[PDB]
Ligand binder design. Sequence first.
Ligand SMILES: Nc1ncnc2c1ncn2[C@@H]1O[C@H](COP(=O)(O)OP(=O)(O)O)[C@@H](O)[C@H]1O
Ligand SMILES: Nc1ncnc2c1ncn2[C@@H]1O[C@H](COP(=O)(O)OP(=O)(O)O)[C@@H](O)[C@H]1O
Ligand SMILES: Cc1cn([C@H]2C[C@H](O)[C@@H](CO)O2)c(=O)nc1N
Ligand SMILES: Cc1cn([C@H]2C[C@H](O)[C@@H](CO)O2)c(=O)nc1N
Lengths: 241, 230
Amino acid sequence: RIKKISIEGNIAAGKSTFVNILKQLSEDWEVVPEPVARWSNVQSTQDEFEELTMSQKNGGNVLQMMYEKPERWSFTFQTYACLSRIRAQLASLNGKLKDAEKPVLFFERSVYSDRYIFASNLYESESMNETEWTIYQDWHDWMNNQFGQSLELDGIIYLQATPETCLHRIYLRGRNEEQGIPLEYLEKLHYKHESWLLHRTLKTNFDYLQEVPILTLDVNEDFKDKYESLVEKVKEFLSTL
Amino acid sequence: TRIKKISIEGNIAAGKSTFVNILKQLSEDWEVVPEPVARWSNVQSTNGGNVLQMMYEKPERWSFTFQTYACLSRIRAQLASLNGKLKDAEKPVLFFERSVYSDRYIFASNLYESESMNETEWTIYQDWHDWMNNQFGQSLELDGIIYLQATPETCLHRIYLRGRNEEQGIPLEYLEKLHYKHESWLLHRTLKTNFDYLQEVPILTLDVNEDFKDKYESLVEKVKEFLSTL
Ligand SMILES: Nc1ncnc2c1ncn2[C@@H]1O[C@H](COP(=O)(O)OP(=O)(O)O)[C@@H](O)[C@H]1O
Ligand SMILES: Nc1ncnc2c1ncn2[C@@H]1O[C@H](COP(=O)(O)OP(=O)(O)O)[C@@H](O)[C@H]1O
Ligand SMILES: Cc1cn([C@H]2C[C@H](O)[C@@H](CO)O2)c(=O)nc1N
Ligand SMILES: Cc1cn([C@H]2C[C@H](O)[C@@H](CO)O2)c(=O)nc1N
Protein backbone atom coordinates (compact mmCIF):
# COMPACT_ATOMS: atom_id res chain seq x y z
CA ARG A 1 0.00 0.00 0.00
CA ILE A 2 3.02 2.25 0.60
CA LYS A 3 3.67 4.38 -2.47
CA LYS A 4 7.36 4.39 -3.37
CA ILE A 5 8.86 7.55 -4.89
CA SER A 6 12.49 7.89 -5.88
CA ILE A 7 14.29 11.25 -5.58
CA GLU A 8 16.94 11.26 -8.36
CA GLY A 9 19.59 13.79 -9.33
CA ASN A 10 23.31 14.36 -9.51
CA ILE A 11 25.82 14.49 -6.66
CA ALA A 12 25.01 17.43 -4.32
CA ALA A 13 21.94 18.48 -6.34
CA GLY A 14 20.04 19.00 -3.01
CA LYS A 15 18.07 15.70 -2.68
CA SER A 16 18.69 15.03 1.01
CA THR A 17 18.04 18.70 1.87
CA PHE A 18 14.82 18.84 -0.15
CA VAL A 19 13.25 15.51 0.76
CA ASN A 20 14.00 15.61 4.50
CA ILE A 21 12.39 18.99 4.73
CA LEU A 22 9.51 17.95 2.43
CA LYS A 23 8.72 14.84 4.53
CA GLN A 24 7.70 17.07 7.47
CA LEU A 25 4.50 18.14 5.66
CA SER A 26 2.84 14.80 6.38
CA GLU A 27 3.06 12.19 9.13
CA ASP A 28 2.35 9.71 6.30
CA TRP A 29 5.61 10.74 4.52
CA GLU A 30 8.92 9.06 5.33
CA VAL A 31 12.37 8.96 3.67
CA VAL A 32 14.95 6.16 3.20
CA PRO A 33 18.30 7.99 2.99
CA GLU A 34 21.22 6.73 0.95
CA PRO A 35 23.70 4.72 3.11
CA VAL A 36 26.63 7.06 2.32
CA ALA A 37 27.83 6.87 5.99
CA ARG A 38 28.12 3.10 5.61
CA TRP A 39 30.34 3.64 2.54
CA SER A 40 32.78 6.06 4.19
CA ASN A 41 33.04 3.86 7.33
CA VAL A 42 32.79 0.19 6.37
CA GLN A 43 31.51 -2.03 9.20
CA SER A 44 29.95 -5.46 9.46
CA THR A 45 27.89 -6.85 12.37
CA GLN A 46 29.56 -7.86 15.64
CA ASP A 47 29.03 -11.19 17.35
CA GLU A 48 26.46 -11.03 20.25
CA PHE A 49 29.09 -11.69 22.95
CA GLU A 50 31.96 -9.79 21.32
CA GLU A 51 29.99 -6.51 21.12
CA LEU A 52 29.72 -6.41 24.91
CA THR A 53 33.47 -5.99 25.45
CA MET A 54 34.72 -4.76 22.08
CA SER A 55 33.82 -1.45 20.43
CA GLN A 56 32.48 -1.28 16.89
CA LYS A 57 35.64 0.11 15.23
CA ASN A 58 35.89 2.60 12.37
CA GLY A 59 36.42 0.59 9.19
CA GLY A 60 37.86 1.42 5.78
CA ASN A 61 36.55 4.16 3.55
CA VAL A 62 35.42 2.51 0.29
CA LEU A 63 33.92 5.74 -1.03
CA GLN A 64 37.36 7.34 -0.81
CA MET A 65 39.08 4.24 -2.16
CA MET A 66 36.85 4.42 -5.23
CA TYR A 67 37.55 8.13 -5.82
CA GLU A 68 41.30 7.63 -5.40
CA LYS A 69 41.56 4.56 -7.67
CA PRO A 70 38.34 3.97 -9.60
CA GLU A 71 39.83 1.34 -11.95
CA ARG A 72 40.61 -0.89 -8.94
CA TRP A 73 37.80 -0.09 -6.50
CA SER A 74 34.69 0.84 -8.61
CA PHE A 75 33.22 -2.68 -8.85
CA THR A 76 33.67 -3.26 -5.10
CA PHE A 77 32.12 0.09 -4.24
CA GLN A 78 29.16 -0.28 -6.65
CA THR A 79 28.33 -3.80 -5.45
CA TYR A 80 28.36 -2.61 -1.81
CA ALA A 81 26.44 0.61 -2.62
CA CYS A 82 23.57 -1.35 -4.09
CA LEU A 83 23.53 -4.11 -1.45
CA SER A 84 23.43 -1.53 1.37
CA ARG A 85 20.64 0.32 -0.44
CA ILE A 86 18.42 -2.67 -0.98
CA ARG A 87 18.92 -3.71 2.66
CA ALA A 88 17.87 -0.29 3.94
CA GLN A 89 14.96 0.13 1.46
CA LEU A 90 13.41 -3.29 2.21
CA ALA A 91 13.57 -2.73 5.95
CA SER A 92 11.68 0.60 5.76
CA LEU A 93 9.15 -0.91 3.40
CA ASN A 94 8.59 -3.67 5.92
CA GLY A 95 8.71 -1.73 9.18
CA LYS A 96 7.43 1.83 8.77
CA LEU A 97 4.20 3.78 8.02
CA LYS A 98 1.92 0.94 9.32
CA ASP A 99 -0.65 3.56 10.51
CA ALA A 100 -0.74 5.96 7.55
CA GLU A 101 -3.88 6.71 5.52
CA LYS A 102 -1.88 7.62 2.39
CA PRO A 103 1.70 6.45 3.12
CA VAL A 104 4.47 7.62 0.83
CA LEU A 105 8.05 6.37 1.16
CA PHE A 106 10.62 8.56 -0.62
CA PHE A 107 13.83 6.85 -1.58
CA GLU A 108 17.01 8.89 -1.92
CA ARG A 109 17.98 7.32 -5.24
CA SER A 110 17.23 3.83 -6.48
CA VAL A 111 18.80 0.56 -7.60
CA TYR A 112 18.22 1.98 -11.12
CA SER A 113 20.50 4.96 -10.61
CA ASP A 114 23.11 2.62 -9.06
CA ARG A 115 23.18 0.60 -12.29
CA TYR A 116 22.20 2.93 -15.14
CA ILE A 117 23.83 6.11 -13.95
CA PHE A 118 26.74 5.39 -11.67
CA ALA A 119 28.00 1.91 -12.57
CA SER A 120 27.26 2.39 -16.25
CA ASN A 121 29.30 5.55 -16.22
CA LEU A 122 32.23 3.72 -14.57
CA TYR A 123 32.04 1.03 -17.27
CA GLU A 124 31.93 3.66 -20.02
CA SER A 125 34.97 5.29 -18.40
CA GLU A 126 36.87 1.94 -18.31
CA SER A 127 36.92 2.09 -14.50
CA MET A 128 35.14 -1.26 -14.65
CA ASN A 129 36.22 -3.83 -17.19
CA GLU A 130 34.04 -6.22 -19.20
CA THR A 131 34.13 -8.99 -16.59
CA GLU A 132 33.27 -6.64 -13.72
CA TRP A 133 30.42 -5.05 -15.70
CA THR A 134 29.00 -8.46 -16.66
CA ILE A 135 29.16 -9.72 -13.05
CA TYR A 136 27.65 -6.49 -11.72
CA GLN A 137 24.72 -6.60 -14.13
CA ASP A 138 24.23 -10.33 -13.56
CA TRP A 139 24.05 -9.73 -9.79
CA HIS A 140 21.86 -6.63 -10.15
CA ASP A 141 19.41 -8.58 -12.44
CA TRP A 142 19.22 -11.54 -10.09
CA MET A 143 18.49 -9.42 -7.03
CA ASN A 144 15.77 -7.45 -8.78
CA ASN A 145 14.03 -10.61 -9.94
CA GLN A 146 14.15 -11.95 -6.35
CA PHE A 147 11.83 -9.21 -5.12
CA GLY A 148 8.42 -9.12 -6.69
CA GLN A 149 7.17 -5.63 -7.09
CA SER A 150 8.38 -4.80 -3.58
CA LEU A 151 10.94 -2.11 -4.54
CA GLU A 152 9.13 -1.10 -7.76
CA LEU A 153 8.61 2.61 -8.05
CA ASP A 154 5.32 4.42 -8.31
CA GLY A 155 6.93 7.71 -9.35
CA ILE A 156 10.24 9.52 -9.75
CA ILE A 157 11.06 13.05 -8.78
CA TYR A 158 14.05 14.31 -10.69
CA LEU A 159 15.90 17.23 -9.11
CA GLN A 160 17.68 18.83 -11.98
CA ALA A 161 20.71 21.00 -11.21
CA THR A 162 23.52 22.01 -13.56
CA PRO A 163 26.93 20.29 -13.26
CA GLU A 164 28.25 23.71 -12.15
CA THR A 165 25.64 24.01 -9.37
CA CYS A 166 26.50 20.47 -8.19
CA LEU A 167 30.21 21.25 -8.17
CA HIS A 168 29.57 24.32 -5.98
CA ARG A 169 27.26 22.34 -3.69
CA ILE A 170 29.90 19.58 -3.30
CA TYR A 171 32.21 22.30 -1.98
CA LEU A 172 29.47 23.77 0.32
CA ARG A 173 28.78 20.35 1.82
CA GLY A 174 32.49 19.58 2.29
CA ARG A 175 32.61 15.76 2.06
CA ASN A 176 36.34 15.06 2.13
CA GLU A 177 36.10 12.18 -0.38
CA GLU A 178 34.39 14.39 -3.01
CA GLN A 179 36.65 17.48 -3.07
CA GLY A 180 38.69 16.21 -6.05
CA ILE A 181 35.66 15.58 -8.31
CA PRO A 182 36.04 17.52 -11.54
CA LEU A 183 33.29 19.18 -13.49
CA GLU A 184 33.80 16.65 -16.36
CA TYR A 185 32.76 13.81 -14.05
CA LEU A 186 29.57 15.60 -12.95
CA GLU A 187 28.75 16.45 -16.57
CA LYS A 188 28.91 12.76 -17.47
CA LEU A 189 26.52 11.92 -14.63
CA HIS A 190 24.31 14.85 -15.69
CA TYR A 191 23.99 13.51 -19.24
CA LYS A 192 22.97 10.04 -17.98
CA HIS A 193 20.30 11.57 -15.76
CA GLU A 194 18.99 13.64 -18.68
CA SER A 195 18.84 10.61 -21.00
CA TRP A 196 17.11 8.50 -18.38
CA LEU A 197 14.70 10.97 -16.87
CA LEU A 198 14.23 13.92 -19.16
CA HIS A 199 14.69 12.73 -22.74
CA ARG A 200 13.70 9.21 -21.64
CA THR A 201 15.86 7.58 -24.31
CA LEU A 202 17.72 5.29 -21.93
CA LYS A 203 16.76 1.61 -22.13
CA THR A 204 16.84 -0.53 -18.97
CA ASN A 205 16.10 -4.18 -18.22
CA PHE A 206 13.00 -3.00 -16.28
CA ASP A 207 10.14 -2.26 -18.68
CA TYR A 208 7.67 -0.74 -16.25
CA LEU A 209 10.14 2.17 -15.90
CA GLN A 210 9.35 3.25 -19.45
CA GLU A 211 5.91 4.19 -18.06
CA VAL A 212 6.62 5.35 -14.46
CA PRO A 213 5.52 9.01 -14.04
CA ILE A 214 8.40 11.48 -13.62
CA LEU A 215 8.28 14.96 -12.08
CA THR A 216 11.27 17.13 -13.09
CA LEU A 217 12.13 20.01 -10.78
CA ASP A 218 14.82 22.64 -11.39
CA VAL A 219 16.76 23.06 -8.10
CA ASN A 220 19.41 25.52 -9.30
CA GLU A 221 17.97 28.44 -7.25
CA ASP A 222 18.70 29.13 -3.61
CA PHE A 223 16.47 26.99 -1.46
CA LYS A 224 14.10 29.80 -0.30
CA ASP A 225 13.53 30.99 -3.84
CA LYS A 226 11.58 28.08 -5.33
CA TYR A 227 10.61 25.84 -2.40
CA GLU A 228 6.93 26.83 -2.36
CA SER A 229 6.34 26.01 -6.02
CA LEU A 230 8.36 22.77 -5.62
CA VAL A 231 6.14 21.62 -2.77
CA GLU A 232 3.04 22.55 -4.82
CA LYS A 233 4.34 20.60 -7.80
CA VAL A 234 5.19 17.58 -5.64
CA LYS A 235 1.70 17.52 -4.07
CA GLU A 236 -0.02 17.84 -7.44
CA PHE A 237 2.22 15.03 -8.76
CA LEU A 238 1.38 12.70 -5.83
CA SER A 239 -2.37 13.25 -6.44
CA THR A 240 -1.95 11.64 -9.89
CA LEU A 241 -0.32 8.45 -8.59
CA THR B 1 10.92 -26.97 2.32
CA ARG B 2 10.55 -30.70 2.97
CA ILE B 3 13.52 -31.25 0.62
CA LYS B 4 16.52 -32.54 2.63
CA LYS B 5 19.61 -30.46 1.86
CA ILE B 6 22.97 -32.18 2.18
CA SER B 7 26.25 -30.40 1.53
CA ILE B 8 29.21 -32.30 0.03
CA GLU B 9 32.37 -30.65 1.32
CA GLY B 10 36.02 -31.24 0.61
CA ASN B 11 39.22 -29.81 -0.79
CA ILE B 12 39.83 -28.99 -4.50
CA ALA B 13 39.74 -32.23 -6.56
CA ALA B 14 38.93 -34.43 -3.54
CA GLY B 15 36.25 -36.12 -5.70
CA LYS B 16 33.03 -34.31 -4.80
CA SER B 17 31.47 -33.96 -8.31
CA THR B 18 32.48 -37.53 -9.01
CA PHE B 19 30.81 -38.80 -5.80
CA VAL B 20 27.63 -36.78 -6.01
CA ASN B 21 27.21 -37.84 -9.71
CA ILE B 22 27.37 -41.50 -8.58
CA LEU B 23 25.04 -40.90 -5.60
CA LYS B 24 22.43 -39.16 -7.78
CA GLN B 25 21.69 -42.40 -9.66
CA LEU B 26 20.56 -44.32 -6.52
CA SER B 27 17.08 -42.79 -6.61
CA GLU B 28 14.93 -40.58 -8.73
CA ASP B 29 14.31 -38.80 -5.39
CA TRP B 30 17.92 -37.58 -5.42
CA GLU B 31 19.14 -34.47 -7.23
CA VAL B 32 22.40 -32.48 -7.33
CA VAL B 33 23.35 -28.81 -7.45
CA PRO B 34 26.87 -28.63 -8.87
CA GLU B 35 29.14 -25.60 -8.42
CA PRO B 36 28.67 -23.55 -11.57
CA VAL B 37 32.37 -23.73 -12.37
CA ALA B 38 31.78 -23.16 -16.13
CA ARG B 39 30.15 -19.81 -15.31
CA TRP B 40 33.32 -18.90 -13.39
CA SER B 41 35.73 -19.71 -16.27
CA ASN B 42 33.42 -18.07 -18.80
CA VAL B 43 31.74 -14.95 -17.46
CA GLN B 44 28.35 -14.24 -19.08
CA SER B 45 24.90 -12.77 -18.40
CA THR B 46 21.90 -15.03 -17.51
CA ASN B 47 33.20 -15.85 -24.98
CA GLY B 48 33.70 -13.89 -21.75
CA GLY B 49 36.25 -13.36 -19.00
CA ASN B 50 37.75 -16.14 -16.97
CA VAL B 51 37.34 -14.88 -13.40
CA LEU B 52 38.66 -18.19 -12.02
CA GLN B 53 41.95 -17.66 -13.88
CA MET B 54 42.03 -13.94 -12.93
CA MET B 55 41.75 -14.86 -9.27
CA TYR B 56 44.47 -17.55 -9.42
CA GLU B 57 46.77 -15.27 -11.46
CA LYS B 58 46.19 -12.00 -9.58
CA PRO B 59 44.58 -12.94 -6.26
CA GLU B 60 45.16 -9.56 -4.50
CA ARG B 61 43.30 -7.85 -7.42
CA TRP B 62 40.60 -10.42 -8.16
CA SER B 63 39.84 -12.51 -5.03
CA PHE B 64 36.97 -10.38 -3.72
CA THR B 65 35.32 -10.19 -7.14
CA PHE B 66 35.65 -13.91 -7.65
CA GLN B 67 34.42 -14.78 -4.06
CA THR B 68 31.38 -12.52 -4.49
CA TYR B 69 30.49 -13.99 -7.86
CA ALA B 70 31.06 -17.59 -6.75
CA CYS B 71 28.76 -17.22 -3.76
CA LEU B 72 26.17 -15.26 -5.76
CA SER B 73 26.07 -17.92 -8.48
CA ARG B 74 25.83 -20.71 -5.87
CA ILE B 75 22.87 -19.11 -4.09
CA ARG B 76 21.21 -18.59 -7.47
CA ALA B 77 21.76 -22.24 -8.45
CA GLN B 78 20.71 -23.74 -5.07
CA LEU B 79 17.52 -21.68 -4.83
CA ALA B 80 16.49 -22.57 -8.44
CA SER B 81 16.90 -26.29 -7.69
CA LEU B 82 14.68 -26.04 -4.61
CA ASN B 83 12.06 -24.00 -6.41
CA GLY B 84 11.57 -26.41 -9.30
CA LYS B 85 13.08 -29.86 -8.88
CA LEU B 86 11.97 -32.95 -6.89
CA LYS B 87 9.10 -31.28 -4.89
CA ASP B 88 6.30 -33.85 -5.15
CA ALA B 89 8.94 -36.60 -4.76
CA GLU B 90 8.61 -39.36 -2.16
CA LYS B 91 11.64 -38.59 -0.01
CA PRO B 92 13.40 -35.70 -1.85
CA VAL B 93 17.10 -35.13 -1.23
CA LEU B 94 19.15 -32.35 -2.77
CA PHE B 95 22.95 -32.72 -2.70
CA PHE B 96 24.86 -29.42 -2.84
CA GLU B 97 28.38 -29.36 -4.20
CA ARG B 98 29.67 -27.18 -1.31
CA SER B 99 27.79 -24.45 0.55
CA VAL B 100 27.73 -20.72 1.30
CA TYR B 101 29.60 -21.67 4.51
CA SER B 102 32.62 -23.12 2.72
CA ASP B 103 32.60 -20.07 0.37
CA ARG B 104 33.03 -17.85 3.43
CA TYR B 105 34.73 -19.73 6.24
CA ILE B 106 37.08 -21.73 4.01
CA PHE B 107 37.82 -19.97 0.72
CA ALA B 108 37.20 -16.28 1.40
CA SER B 109 38.60 -16.57 4.89
CA ASN B 110 41.86 -18.14 3.62
CA LEU B 111 42.17 -15.29 1.12
CA TYR B 112 41.80 -12.71 3.89
CA GLU B 113 44.35 -14.64 5.98
CA SER B 114 46.80 -14.70 3.05
CA GLU B 115 46.32 -10.93 2.52
CA SER B 116 44.66 -11.57 -0.90
CA MET B 117 41.75 -9.53 0.38
CA ASN B 118 42.33 -6.45 2.56
CA GLU B 119 40.33 -5.46 5.71
CA THR B 120 37.84 -3.40 3.74
CA GLU B 121 37.23 -6.14 1.16
CA TRP B 122 36.85 -8.76 3.92
CA THR B 123 34.40 -6.56 5.89
CA ILE B 124 32.34 -5.88 2.73
CA TYR B 125 32.30 -9.59 1.85
CA GLN B 126 31.12 -10.55 5.36
CA ASP B 127 28.43 -7.78 5.32
CA TRP B 128 27.31 -8.94 1.86
CA HIS B 129 27.25 -12.58 3.01
CA ASP B 130 25.34 -11.93 6.26
CA TRP B 131 22.69 -10.02 4.36
CA MET B 132 22.41 -12.25 1.26
CA ASN B 133 21.90 -15.14 3.68
CA ASN B 134 19.52 -13.32 6.07
CA GLN B 135 17.04 -13.44 3.18
CA PHE B 136 17.96 -16.85 1.75
CA GLY B 137 19.55 -18.41 4.86
CA GLN B 138 16.39 -20.20 5.96
CA SER B 139 15.48 -21.87 2.66
CA LEU B 140 19.02 -23.17 2.07
CA GLU B 141 19.70 -24.49 5.61
CA LEU B 142 21.57 -27.82 5.65
CA ASP B 143 20.17 -31.07 7.05
CA GLY B 144 23.50 -32.92 6.92
CA ILE B 145 27.07 -32.56 5.65
CA ILE B 146 29.21 -35.13 3.83
CA TYR B 147 32.89 -34.42 4.27
CA LEU B 148 35.02 -36.09 1.58
CA GLN B 149 38.45 -36.34 3.17
CA ALA B 150 41.54 -36.49 0.91
CA THR B 151 45.11 -35.46 1.67
CA PRO B 152 46.54 -32.31 0.15
CA GLU B 153 48.84 -34.63 -1.88
CA THR B 154 45.87 -36.67 -3.14
CA CYS B 155 44.12 -33.42 -4.14
CA LEU B 156 47.19 -32.09 -5.94
CA HIS B 157 47.45 -35.29 -8.00
CA ARG B 158 43.72 -35.08 -8.88
CA ILE B 159 44.07 -31.45 -9.94
CA TYR B 160 46.58 -32.87 -12.46
CA LEU B 161 44.31 -35.80 -13.42
CA ARG B 162 41.38 -33.47 -14.07
CA GLY B 163 43.46 -30.95 -16.06
CA ARG B 164 41.59 -27.67 -15.44
CA ASN B 165 44.08 -25.14 -16.92
CA GLU B 166 43.42 -22.44 -14.23
CA GLU B 167 44.44 -24.85 -11.42
CA GLN B 168 47.64 -26.34 -12.73
CA GLY B 169 49.87 -23.88 -10.84
CA ILE B 170 48.22 -24.26 -7.42
CA PRO B 171 51.03 -25.26 -5.02
CA LEU B 172 50.75 -28.01 -2.39
CA GLU B 173 50.90 -25.45 0.46
CA TYR B 174 47.72 -23.69 -0.78
CA LEU B 175 45.91 -27.07 -0.63
CA GLU B 176 47.39 -27.60 2.87
CA LYS B 177 45.86 -24.33 4.04
CA LEU B 178 42.41 -25.34 2.67
CA HIS B 179 42.77 -28.77 4.22
CA TYR B 180 43.49 -27.28 7.68
CA LYS B 181 40.33 -25.13 7.47
CA HIS B 182 38.23 -28.14 6.45
CA GLU B 183 39.57 -30.24 9.33
CA SER B 184 39.05 -27.39 11.78
CA TRP B 185 35.46 -26.93 10.54
CA LEU B 186 34.32 -30.45 9.98
CA LEU B 187 36.60 -32.79 11.98
CA HIS B 188 37.82 -30.82 15.01
CA ARG B 189 34.73 -28.56 14.92
CA THR B 190 36.83 -25.63 16.20
CA LEU B 191 35.83 -23.25 13.37
CA LYS B 192 32.90 -21.07 14.63
CA THR B 193 30.44 -19.37 12.23
CA ASN B 194 27.68 -16.74 12.34
CA PHE B 195 25.14 -19.55 11.87
CA ASP B 196 24.32 -21.26 15.15
CA TYR B 197 22.18 -24.02 13.63
CA LEU B 198 25.30 -25.49 11.99
CA GLN B 199 26.85 -26.63 15.27
CA GLU B 200 23.89 -29.11 15.38
CA VAL B 201 24.17 -30.46 11.82
CA PRO B 202 25.42 -34.08 11.66
CA ILE B 203 28.53 -34.77 9.58
CA LEU B 204 29.48 -38.03 7.83
CA THR B 205 33.18 -38.10 7.14
CA LEU B 206 34.31 -40.32 4.24
CA ASP B 207 37.95 -41.12 3.38
CA VAL B 208 38.35 -40.83 -0.42
CA ASN B 209 42.13 -41.07 -0.65
CA GLU B 210 42.05 -44.44 -2.33
CA ASP B 211 41.54 -45.05 -6.05
CA PHE B 212 37.79 -45.52 -6.73
CA LYS B 213 38.63 -48.87 -8.35
CA ASP B 214 38.73 -49.91 -4.65
CA LYS B 215 36.47 -49.08 -1.69
CA TYR B 216 33.71 -46.92 -3.29
CA GLU B 217 30.79 -49.34 -2.75
CA SER B 218 30.95 -49.06 1.06
CA LEU B 219 31.07 -45.21 0.93
CA VAL B 220 27.88 -44.95 -1.17
CA GLU B 221 25.84 -47.37 0.97
CA LYS B 222 27.15 -45.49 4.02
CA VAL B 223 25.60 -42.27 2.62
CA LYS B 224 22.32 -44.05 1.76
CA GLU B 225 22.09 -44.89 5.48
CA PHE B 226 23.31 -41.54 6.93
CA LEU B 227 20.32 -39.99 5.10
CA SER B 228 17.96 -42.42 6.91
CA THR B 229 19.04 -40.90 10.24
CA LEU B 230 18.07 -37.35 9.13
N1 LIG C 1 18.53 24.98 -3.10
C1 LIG C 1 19.67 25.08 -2.40
N2 LIG C 1 20.27 26.27 -2.14
C2 LIG C 1 21.41 26.36 -1.43
N3 LIG C 1 22.04 25.28 -0.91
C3 LIG C 1 21.53 24.02 -1.12
C4 LIG C 1 20.28 23.84 -1.89
N4 LIG C 1 19.99 22.52 -1.91
C5 LIG C 1 21.00 21.89 -1.24
N5 LIG C 1 21.89 22.79 -0.76
C6 LIG C 1 23.16 22.55 -0.06
O1 LIG C 1 23.98 21.88 -1.06
C7 LIG C 1 24.69 20.79 -0.46
C8 LIG C 1 24.30 19.46 -1.10
O2 LIG C 1 22.96 19.14 -0.73
P1 LIG C 1 22.47 17.67 -0.39
O3 LIG C 1 21.01 17.69 -0.05
O4 LIG C 1 23.43 17.15 0.63
O5 LIG C 1 22.69 16.99 -1.85
P2 LIG C 1 22.41 15.47 -2.33
O6 LIG C 1 21.58 14.83 -1.26
O7 LIG C 1 21.72 15.58 -3.67
O8 LIG C 1 23.78 14.89 -2.54
C9 LIG C 1 24.42 20.89 1.04
O9 LIG C 1 25.51 21.64 1.60
C10 LIG C 1 23.17 21.74 1.21
O10 LIG C 1 23.35 22.70 2.26
N1 LIG D 1 38.37 -41.85 -5.62
C1 LIG D 1 38.98 -41.50 -6.77
N2 LIG D 1 39.93 -42.26 -7.38
C2 LIG D 1 40.52 -41.92 -8.54
N3 LIG D 1 40.26 -40.78 -9.19
C3 LIG D 1 39.32 -39.91 -8.69
C4 LIG D 1 38.63 -40.22 -7.43
N4 LIG D 1 37.77 -39.23 -7.18
C5 LIG D 1 37.94 -38.32 -8.17
N5 LIG D 1 38.84 -38.75 -9.08
C6 LIG D 1 39.30 -38.01 -10.29
O1 LIG D 1 39.96 -36.86 -9.74
C7 LIG D 1 39.59 -35.67 -10.45
C8 LIG D 1 38.88 -34.68 -9.51
O2 LIG D 1 37.58 -35.17 -9.16
P1 LIG D 1 36.31 -34.22 -9.06
O3 LIG D 1 35.11 -35.12 -8.69
O4 LIG D 1 36.18 -33.40 -10.30
O5 LIG D 1 36.73 -33.31 -7.79
P2 LIG D 1 35.96 -32.09 -7.01
O6 LIG D 1 34.57 -32.03 -7.55
O7 LIG D 1 36.13 -32.51 -5.57
O8 LIG D 1 36.84 -30.91 -7.34
C9 LIG D 1 38.75 -36.11 -11.63
O9 LIG D 1 39.63 -36.26 -12.76
C10 LIG D 1 38.21 -37.48 -11.20
O10 LIG D 1 37.92 -38.36 -12.30
C1 LIG E 1 24.48 5.75 -5.17
C2 LIG E 1 25.89 5.98 -5.62
C3 LIG E 1 26.60 7.07 -5.11
N1 LIG E 1 27.87 7.27 -5.51
C4 LIG E 1 28.65 8.35 -4.91
C5 LIG E 1 28.25 9.78 -5.24
C6 LIG E 1 28.54 10.50 -3.92
O1 LIG E 1 29.93 10.85 -3.86
C7 LIG E 1 28.29 9.46 -2.83
C8 LIG E 1 26.94 9.69 -2.13
O2 LIG E 1 25.80 9.53 -3.02
O3 LIG E 1 28.40 8.20 -3.49
C9 LIG E 1 28.43 6.43 -6.39
O4 LIG E 1 29.68 6.61 -6.83
N2 LIG E 1 27.76 5.39 -6.92
C10 LIG E 1 26.51 5.14 -6.55
N3 LIG E 1 25.91 4.05 -7.09
C1 LIG F 1 33.48 -22.35 -4.11
C2 LIG F 1 34.84 -21.76 -4.33
C3 LIG F 1 35.72 -22.41 -5.20
N1 LIG F 1 36.96 -21.90 -5.41
C4 LIG F 1 37.84 -22.55 -6.39
C5 LIG F 1 38.35 -23.93 -6.07
C6 LIG F 1 38.38 -24.62 -7.44
O1 LIG F 1 39.58 -24.29 -8.14
C7 LIG F 1 37.28 -23.96 -8.26
C8 LIG F 1 36.05 -24.87 -8.40
O2 LIG F 1 35.56 -25.14 -7.08
O3 LIG F 1 37.04 -22.71 -7.60
C9 LIG F 1 37.35 -20.78 -4.80
O4 LIG F 1 38.61 -20.32 -5.01
N2 LIG F 1 36.51 -20.13 -3.96
C10 LIG F 1 35.26 -20.61 -3.70
N3 LIG F 1 34.42 -19.95 -2.87
